[PDB]
Design an enzyme around this catalytic site. Structure first.
Site, PDB file in Angstrom:
ATOM      1  N   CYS A 106      36.310  29.074  -5.258  1.00  5.15           N
ATOM      2  CA  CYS A 106      35.931  28.034  -5.744  1.00  5.15           C
ATOM      3  C   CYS A 106      34.300  27.345  -5.645  1.00  5.15           C
ATOM      4  CB  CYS A 106      37.032  26.587  -6.604  1.00  5.15           C
ATOM      5  SG  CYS A 106      36.684  25.432  -7.321  1.00  5.15           S
ATOM      6  N   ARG A 109      34.301  22.854  -5.805  1.00  2.00           N
ATOM      7  CA  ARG A 109      35.236  21.766  -5.151  1.00  2.00           C
ATOM      8  C   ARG A 109      34.919  20.731  -4.328  1.00  2.00           C
ATOM      9  NH1 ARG A 109      37.143  26.321  -0.390  1.00  2.00           N
ATOM     10  NH2 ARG A 109      34.989  26.867  -0.994  1.00  2.00           N
ATOM     11  N   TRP A 278      35.793  22.349 -15.640  1.00  2.00           N
ATOM     12  CA  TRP A 278      34.887  22.607 -16.704  1.00  2.00           C
ATOM     13  C   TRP A 278      34.183  23.641 -16.517  1.00  2.00           C
ATOM     14  CZ3 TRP A 278      34.805  17.616 -14.754  1.00  2.00           C
ATOM     15  CH2 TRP A 278      33.822  17.516 -12.791  1.00  2.00           C
TER      16      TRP A 278
HETATM   17  C1  HEM Z   1      35.521  21.429 -12.161  1.00  2.00           C
HETATM   18  C2  HEM Z   1      34.832  21.788 -12.263  1.00  2.00           C
HETATM   19  C3  HEM Z   1      35.230  23.175 -11.468  1.00  2.00           C
HETATM   20  C4  HEM Z   1      34.328  24.511 -11.525  1.00  2.00           C
HETATM   21  C5  HEM Z   1      32.546  24.357 -11.666  1.00  2.00           C
HETATM   22  C6  HEM Z   1      34.979  25.424 -11.117  1.00  2.00           C
HETATM   23  C7  HEM Z   1      33.883  26.965 -10.869  1.00  2.00           C
HETATM   24  C8  HEM Z   1      34.829  28.246 -10.738  1.00  2.00           C
HETATM   25  C9  HEM Z   1      34.326  28.718 -10.886  1.00  2.00           C
HETATM   26  C10 HEM Z   1      32.567  29.642 -10.610  1.00  2.00           C
HETATM   27  C11 HEM Z   1      34.811  30.058  -9.902  1.00  2.00           C
HETATM   28  C12 HEM Z   1      34.820  31.624  -9.931  1.00  2.00           C
HETATM   29  C13 HEM Z   1      36.204  32.243 -11.037  1.00  2.00           C
HETATM   30  C14 HEM Z   1      35.469  33.399 -11.736  1.00  2.00           C
HETATM   31  O1  HEM Z   1      34.059  33.922 -12.010  1.00  2.00           O
HETATM   32  O2  HEM Z   1      36.397  34.189 -12.366  1.00  2.00           O
HETATM   33  C15 HEM Z   1      36.392  29.652  -9.624  1.00  2.00           C
HETATM   34  C16 HEM Z   1      37.578  30.055  -8.876  1.00  2.00           C
HETATM   35  C17 HEM Z   1      38.606  28.973  -8.839  1.00  2.00           C
HETATM   36  N1  HEM Z   1      38.467  27.692  -8.963  1.00  2.00           N
HETATM   37 FE1  HEM Z   1      37.155  26.220  -9.194  1.00  2.00          FE
HETATM   38  N2  HEM Z   1      36.094  25.117 -10.821  1.00  2.00           N
HETATM   39  C18 HEM Z   1      36.451  24.199 -11.522  1.00  2.00           C
HETATM   40  C19 HEM Z   1      37.677  23.281 -10.861  1.00  2.00           C
HETATM   41  C20 HEM Z   1      38.388  23.461 -10.101  1.00  2.00           C
HETATM   42  C21 HEM Z   1      39.323  23.483 -10.421  1.00  2.00           C
HETATM   43  C22 HEM Z   1      40.439  21.958 -11.037  1.00  2.00           C
HETATM   44  C23 HEM Z   1      40.974  23.762  -9.319  1.00  2.00           C
HETATM   45  C24 HEM Z   1      42.432  23.575  -9.015  1.00  2.00           C
HETATM   46  C25 HEM Z   1      42.632  22.392  -9.077  1.00  2.00           C
HETATM   47  C26 HEM Z   1      40.375  25.187  -9.349  1.00  2.00           C
HETATM   48  C27 HEM Z   1      40.141  26.232  -8.202  1.00  2.00           C
HETATM   49  C28 HEM Z   1      39.552  27.499  -8.892  1.00  2.00           C
HETATM   50  C29 HEM Z   1      40.486  28.594  -7.829  1.00  2.00           C
HETATM   51  C30 HEM Z   1      42.024  28.782  -7.094  1.00  2.00           C
HETATM   52  C31 HEM Z   1      39.159  29.322  -8.185  1.00  2.00           C
HETATM   53  C32 HEM Z   1      39.651  30.860  -6.983  1.00  2.00           C
HETATM   54  C33 HEM Z   1      40.425  31.985  -8.428  1.00  2.00           C
HETATM   55  C34 HEM Z   1      41.014  33.246  -8.183  1.00  2.00           C
HETATM   56  O3  HEM Z   1      40.461  33.188  -7.339  1.00  2.00           O
HETATM   57  O4  HEM Z   1      40.736  33.651  -8.943  1.00  2.00           O
HETATM   58  N3  HEM Z   1      38.744  25.378  -9.822  1.00  2.00           N
HETATM   59  N4  HEM Z   1      35.911  28.295  -9.639  1.00  2.00           N
HETATM   60  C1  LIG Z   2      39.792  25.604 -13.186  1.00  2.00           C
HETATM   61  C2  LIG Z   2      38.539  26.098 -13.531  1.00  2.00           C
HETATM   62  C3  LIG Z   2      37.136  26.630 -13.547  1.00  2.00           C
HETATM   63  C4  LIG Z   2      36.299  27.334 -13.907  1.00  2.00           C
HETATM   64  N1  LIG Z   2      34.878  26.359 -14.104  1.00  2.00           N
HETATM   65  N2  LIG Z   2      36.061  28.288 -14.126  1.00  2.00           N
HETATM   66  C5  LIG Z   2      37.504  28.980 -13.836  1.00  2.00           C
HETATM   67  C6  LIG Z   2      37.663  30.287 -13.957  1.00  2.00           C
HETATM   68  C7  LIG Z   2      38.648  31.241 -12.854  1.00  2.00           C
HETATM   69  C8  LIG Z   2      39.362  32.126 -12.850  1.00  2.00           C
HETATM   70  C9  LIG Z   2      40.849  32.162 -12.240  1.00  2.00           C
HETATM   71  C10 LIG Z   2      41.328  33.506 -12.202  1.00  2.00           C
HETATM   72  F1  LIG Z   2      42.537  33.172 -11.527  1.00  2.00           F
HETATM   73  C11 LIG Z   2      40.267  35.009 -12.432  1.00  2.00           C
HETATM   74  C12 LIG Z   2      39.819  34.491 -13.183  1.00  2.00           C
HETATM   75  C13 LIG Z   2      39.218  35.935 -14.470  1.00  2.00           C
HETATM   76  C14 LIG Z   2      39.956  36.502 -13.626  1.00  2.00           C
HETATM   77  C15 LIG Z   2      39.592  38.385 -13.790  1.00  2.00           C
HETATM   78  C16 LIG Z   2      40.212  39.333 -13.808  1.00  2.00           C
HETATM   79  C17 LIG Z   2      38.462  40.488 -13.202  1.00  2.00           C
HETATM   80  F2  LIG Z   2      39.106  40.913 -12.258  1.00  2.00           F
HETATM   81  C18 LIG Z   2      37.958  38.912 -12.208  1.00  2.00           C
HETATM   82  N3  LIG Z   2      38.566  37.868 -12.402  1.00  2.00           N
HETATM   83  C19 LIG Z   2      38.246  32.584 -13.415  1.00  2.00           C
HETATM   84  C20 LIG Z   2      38.744  27.913 -13.746  1.00  2.00           C
END
Ligand code: HEM
Ligand SMILES: Cc1cc(N)nc(CCc2cc(F)cc(CC[C@@H]3C[C@H](F)CN3)c2)c1
Ligand code: HEM
Ligand SMILES: Cc1cc(N)nc(CCc2cc(F)cc(CC[C@@H]3C[C@H](F)CN3)c2)c1
Ligand SMILES: C[C@H](O)[C@H](O)[C@H]1CNc2nc(N)[nH]c(=O)c2N1
Ligand SMILES: C[C@H](O)[C@H](O)[C@H]1CNc2nc(N)[nH]c(=O)c2N1
Ligand SMILES: [Zn+2]
Lengths: 407, 411
Positions: A106, A109, A278
């Site tokens: 993420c 964070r 967001w």
């Molecule tokens: C507040 C603004 C936030 C931004 C800008 C942000 C941004 C991102 C981005 C760009 C990713 C990459 C995922 C992708 O490309 O599909 C990501 C993944 C992730 N975010 Fe953040 N996020 C935010 C908030 C949060 C919050 C509030 C949580 C949990 C309380 C969180 C937990 C996670 C987790 C667990 C992942 C990994 C998901 C996965 O492994 O598929 N995020 N986030």
């Molecule tokens: C809270 C939050 C904020 C943000 N700004 N953005 C996101 C998107 C993060 C996210 C988490 C996931 F758990 C899965 C995805 C997409 C799933 C795909 C499946 C493909 F295989 C690769 N990822 C995206 C979440």
């Protein structure tokens, strides 16, 4: 065994000691790195509970104190008696914020401590889940001034009474196979849309149909609900210089809200825990709009720009990609919906990483996911070495419910 | 054991068995992944197993495993190791080894070409002047008037580590960098330290923005010596833009031939500390990293100015906009001057095909996703969605310490 990470743009070196608390496995070994793979009883519980409670009471500067020892004893009592145990509200809030703090993939964070935690452990039915999720959506959307939030439903017990949100995100668009052979809407969601139709959804068969919620409480069969249309904030996508861009019919929703992960705190598992923040602009404009397996509009935008699409070396794909992503940021900003561009977000993550090394001894980070999917090397995360390890509390993947749910 | 990789764009699933032949370690553990870390004397004891493993591989590839020739070669190398503590590769083994070091280079996106490598055997070289002649002939052959050809030149292997051959340049052709007293840099900021070394060794620096550095060449462990590559052998390309006529006025150029000269080639336990190799450029190596890294020429600001992009907030994506136009200009210029170059779309599509081919016929293809994905437009290239497995096969190219940190000076 104490580790250095170097930034090759600034020459700053940080020392990681937090990784020696790593509790889960990475999927890598000494012989093979798996860093690019998308997805690599009472006795187990009390050491898990003890480790979480130890860090919790250390964080509140009450380590080894009476209240610490008393809680440790009380949780121990509860596990022997009731096989599981319940978290105090304070522990639940701490556990949830730290799960986000620990999410190595993420980039956002820097905000981890400002999360709004909604305790939904008193929920008993899918109808209650829907009310809790509508309130989450409205609170987080906040008329476009988005606020981070998570809603935590009752913890797993015997595994036969799980709470699950069957949707992968709270708000996504449907995808339909055309007799044609093409795909209408979001191709990422064709299978889940099928299950909604299978459960009785009346699909509008449009290009941007907000899917219904499929909610499972207490291990029961899941039920269908439609999010109130006026709670789903959407943004029509236009471009600040190309008048024709609006003619493409593009819009996206404002609230990214992940609903299929599993939150682990102190060995307890929360199988339903939707969380939202967001968007970073590129999540929409690069991945949603330009992935070949998604809306795949690169070709169309490039034709309206009158680019030489004969040869890849004119970089027509690259030129259109920038313009689509300009439009996405311009549209959200114009409509006063919170959004962050990949330069701002990655620069924030570097400040955060420095804070975490300074005050925590490290920051687990997955470079493959942190570096944005466009303009990689002109963001500062590209030149930042990162150590990836798994801390708890944590968000984890879990199997899709339709593959596991006895019907 | 079988390992599977998925491409998340196409749902192709491949199965890796080749990782079972991996000997060297990765730096990762079950508890930490070091996949984004940049960089994570040999007795007869371990040498013969390393020889025997390489020779088994070699004779397997020529379908002669277990043959009399194979067994005789092993006997011959065995005696040569116990007698002389080392051994000498046949020409065929050296060619095979150098091609496979490239084939095994998990960070290289250009590996579709691995079997078309021109190997120049410089193991008879003994002096720095002789190194200079060999390197000039490499540059001339590889440049080929702009129709670039892959090549490697291999100098004598390490013996006791006190008589190493080394090219002190990181690349055969690079521009000097000069730190100014006011803190600014003239030329390539990456090469300030090496430029100072050269000046200390007697190089008379023109002190311009695009000065080709001299070669600093160390033979048989002696102190290194300075040599100026003949300028007529250094093919250069002035950078212009197909639509923007002010772009030529930026005064940019680059050299045509990328040639890495500071790595170590390991073949069957032998260490070739001087083995410069060269191919041709992928456009983004110049237009994204060399021109647009903040720690390099750093022209994004200037270019974005000339396009009069809104630069007051990064949300305009003016950096991304100027980045694309610089990379268009670099590809346009090389193609216009008929100097070989590949764009990152072409290059990554070819690597995907190569990798699938390698899975079918070799059982695997080690690949470092962090390095394989281009530094711009990552996800509109097919490698972004491709899961990869990173592991280390021999023969291999390895990093080595910079010589000025280890060299014992004679005077
Ligand atoms: C507040 C603004 C936030 C931004 C800008 C942000 C941004 C991102 C981005 C760009 C990713 C990459 C995922 C992708 O490309 O599909 C990501 C993944 C992730 N975010 Fe953040 N996020 C935010 C908030 C949060 C919050 C509030 C949580 C949990 C309380 C969180 C937990 C996670 C987790 C667990 C992942 C990994 C998901 C996965 O492994 O598929 N995020 N986030
Ligand atoms: C809270 C939050 C904020 C943000 N700004 N953005 C996101 C998107 C993060 C996210 C988490 C996931 F758990 C899965 C995805 C997409 C799933 C795909 C499946 C493909 F295989 C690769 N990822 C995206 C979440
Ligand atoms: C023929 C055209 C070639 C192309 C287009 C190409 C492309 C690339 C690129 C883009 C990189 C990343 C470089 C960086 O970011 O600094 C790389 C790395 C590498 N290439 Fe290739 N390459 C080519 C030829 C070769 C040859 C001939 C060899 C060896 C015989 C080779 C071996 C390597 C190695 C060992 C690396 C890793 C460098 C490191 O770890 O720092 N390549 N290549
Ligand atoms: C044969 C070949 C072809 C091609 N098309 N391209 C390359 C570039 C490979 C390369 C390898 C290195 F070992 C170092 C560099 C540049 C130096 C920077 C400085 C830091 F050390 C990291 N690399 C480039 C090589
Ligand atoms: C820290 C990080 O590993 C470093 O910036 C890497 C990332 N990926 C790269 N990829 C390539 N091709 N070349 C590089 O120099 C780098 N640098
Ligand atoms: C194969 C590779 O792991 C896969 O494409 C990853 C790469 N990096 C990513 N990075 C982010 N932020 N999100 C993703 O979905 C992915 N997908
Ligand atoms: Zn790893």
């Amino acid at each position: 065994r104490f580790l250095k990470v170097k930034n090759w743009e600034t020459d700053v070196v940080l020392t990681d000691t937090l990784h020696l608390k790593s509790t889960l496995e990475t999927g890598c070994t000494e012989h093979i790195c798996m860093g690019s793979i998308m997805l690599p009883t009472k006795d187990q519980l009390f050491p898990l509970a003890k480790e979480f409670l130890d860090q919790y009471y250390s964080s509140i500067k009450r380590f080894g104190s009476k209240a610490h020892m008393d809680r440790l004893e009380e949780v121990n009592k509860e596990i022997e008696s009731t096989s599981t145990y319940q978290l105090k509200d304070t522990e639940l809030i701490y556990g949830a914020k730290h799960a986000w703090r620990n999410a190595s993939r993420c980039v956002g964070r820097i905000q981890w401590s400002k999360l709004q935690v909604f305790d939904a452990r008193d929920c008993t039915t899918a109808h209650g889940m829907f009310n809790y999720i509508c309130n989450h959506v409205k609170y987080a959307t906040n008329k476009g001034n988005l606020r981070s939030a998570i809603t935590i439903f009752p913890q797993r017990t015997d595994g036969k009474h799980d709470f699950r949100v069957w949707n992968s995100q709270l708000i996504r668009y449907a995808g339909y196979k055309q007799p044609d052979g093409s795909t209408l809407g979001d191709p990422a969601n064709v299978q889940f849309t099928e299950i909604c139709i299978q459960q009785g959804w009346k699909a509008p068969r449009g290009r941007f149909d907000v899917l219904p919620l499929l909610l499972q409480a207490n291990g029961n069969d899941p039920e269908l609900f439609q999010i109130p249309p006026e709670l789903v904030l959407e943004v029509p996508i236009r471009h600040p210089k190309f008048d024709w861009f609006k003619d493409l019919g593009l819009k996206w929703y404002g609230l990214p809200a992940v609903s299929n992960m599993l939150l682990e705190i102190g060995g307890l598992e929360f199988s339903a825990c939707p969380f939202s923040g967001w968007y970073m602009g590129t999540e929409i404009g690069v991945r949603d709009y330009c992935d070949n397996s998604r809306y795949n509009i690169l070709e169309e935008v490039a034709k309206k720009m009158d680019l030489d699409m004969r040869k890849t070396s004119s970089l027509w794909k690259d030129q259109a990609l920038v313009e689509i992503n300009i439009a996405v940021l311009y549209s959200f900003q114009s409509d006063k919906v919170t959004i962050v561009d990949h330069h701002s977000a990655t620069e924030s993550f570097i400040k955060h990483m420095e804070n975490e090394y300074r005050c925590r001894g490290g920051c687990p980070a997955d470079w493959v996911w942190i570096v944005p999917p466009m303009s990689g090397s002109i963001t500062p995360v590209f030149h930042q070495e990162m150590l990836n390890y798994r801390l708890t509390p944590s968000f984890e993947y879990q199997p899709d419910p339709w593959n596991t749910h006895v019907w």
